[PDB]
Amino acid sequence: FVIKGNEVSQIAPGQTGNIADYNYKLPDDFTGCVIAWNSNKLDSKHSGN
Amino acid sequence: FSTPSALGKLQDVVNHNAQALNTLVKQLSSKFGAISSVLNDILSRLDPP
16 A cells, blocks of 8 residues: 555554554554555656646 | 450451451552553553554
8 A cells, every 4th residue: 555654653553543543454463564665756746646 | 354465366367367458459559660550541541552
């Protein structure tokens, strides 16, 4: 999935916010890896994507 | 009848068991390093992890 930088911290166990609560939620006992990187050069447009 | 200390051997047993139970209950109000002694305050103030 694609999210905002201020929402990257929400892809973690126990977090709250519009993404953690309504789009994608991890279990409290989640085991695994959360990998994130900047995609501004690929997803952004001057008109807005 | 006259000597109030005559039965101390039994009164000490009663008092020691009463003190042990009162101490055990009083320990429930301690924090042991936690922010609060009440589980509901911890659950409502902090996120799961």
